[PDB]
């Protein structure tokens, strides 16, 4: 495996996450269902969890995109619970350094999940565990 090809793969996934989020948010703005993150989260999560790509994905700022997928939609509603659960599980597996957290600010959305009274017991627990992990580490 060629590290130029790894980088291509990482940048490709970053663009794909960006494009899906944009289309979801535009649909939401126009009062239409968002379905793109829902349709693609399981496949994209499998790639985000590739051990061979993780250093590169983090290097290429992928936490920006993960954060966006977790953030409220333009109408202030939260993304579908399937995304919430799955991306928290992805983040748990990543060797995330202090610097990645600082530049992405993914900690802020994850912390909100950890204190959101309307969140499911299970997702809120996962978000609490990630906050604790990222505190423990930092």
């Amino acid at each position: 495996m060629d590290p130029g090809t790894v980088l291509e793969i990482s940048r490709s996934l970053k663009k794909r996450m960006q494009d899906i989020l944009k289309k979801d948010n535009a649909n939401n703005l126009e009062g239409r269902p968002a379905t793109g993150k829902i349709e693609n989260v399981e496949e994209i999560s499998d790639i985000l969890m590739s051990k061979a790509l993780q250093e590169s994905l983090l290097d290429e700022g992928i936490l920006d995109e993960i954060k966006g997928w977790l953030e409220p939609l333009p109408d202030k509603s939260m993304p579908n619970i399937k995304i919430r659960k799955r991306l928290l599980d992805v983040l748990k597996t990543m060797k995330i350094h202090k610097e990645h957290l600082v530049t992405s600010g993914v900690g802020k959305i994850v912390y909100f999940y950890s204190i959101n009274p309307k969140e499911s017991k299970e997702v809120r627990a996962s978000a609490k565990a990630l906050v604790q992990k990222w505190t423990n580490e930092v």
Binding site: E71, G105, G107, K108, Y111, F112, T135, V138
Partner: peptide, 20 residues
């Protein structure tokens, strides 16, 4: 500014979702 604030903010960034 402390590292905790750089990472987690003030913890009010998304409170507008609840107030909605």
């Amino acid at each position: 500014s402390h590292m905790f604030f750089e990472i987690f903010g003030t913890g009010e960034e998304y409170r507008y979702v609840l107030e909605s």
